[PDB]
Amino acid sequence: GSHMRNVAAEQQLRELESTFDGRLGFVALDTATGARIAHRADERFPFCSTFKTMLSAAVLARSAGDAALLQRRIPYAKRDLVRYSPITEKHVGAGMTVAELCAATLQYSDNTAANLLIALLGGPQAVTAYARSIGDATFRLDRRETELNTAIPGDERDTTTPAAMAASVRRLLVGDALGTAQRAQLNAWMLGNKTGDARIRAGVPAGWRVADKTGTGDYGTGNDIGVAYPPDRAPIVFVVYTTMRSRNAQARDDVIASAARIAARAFV
């Protein structure tokens, strides 16, 4: 790629934002060169379910010094369920293993699974602490599911910036924040995501493998973060955050795919 292609990409991202009643936060980092395509990279956005990557990384980091942690079964009752728990709703009572909860929260965005893992780690503050430990000074998890998706304008609870999240995703999925086995497992879970077919995956070349985690919330908040693995190039980190001015707004898969498409064309 080149500086001029990246500049043009950034202009195209500004044009894309002008098509909807909201704002676009975007970073694509080419790990071949360290080059970045950015749009509103240092504005805070509500992360919604994209935090589940940070959450699962924290669990994996803990498992590195306690292999049997991943097999621990966590019980829970129906009364502990929250909205959007398609996997955990099927296993109330005896519950599920820690590994199963990670797969559920990453691949189906299961909310109760996330709450159980947040509890296991020591609460929302423990997830923020993990982020701090990997060099992320920006990420903050303040609430649990599903309140963390309120996406209220000016509310800094449960937010990060596209730049901070891209740096963290790079460290976790490509770099050395996790041990080899743990990085492989985090990638494996995210490669098998079921909720992201219309987002980053829809915008980048079909030949690229994508490990992603989506987020959707109030104010039409529509997010997707992850890494694309081209067959002939180094990995590219993608972070796409969008949110809208109206409470009646809905997330826009197409805008997220379009943003990724614009950047993919520049990193040649």
Residue numbers in the entry: 22 to 238, 240 to 252, 254 to 291
Publication passage describing the model:
In class A β-lactamases, a conserved structural element called the omega loop5 constitutes a wall at the active site that shapes the binding cavity. PenL (NCBI reference sequence: YP_439646.1) is highly conserved in pathogenic Burkholderia species, including Burkholderia pseudomallei, Burkholderia mallei, and Burkholderia cenocepacia. PenL has been used as a model in exploring various evolutionary paths to substrate spectrum extension through amino acid substitutions, deletions, and duplications. In this study, we demonstrate the extensive perturbation-absorbing capacity of the omega loop against TR mutations of various sizes, some of which are large enough to include the entire omega loop.
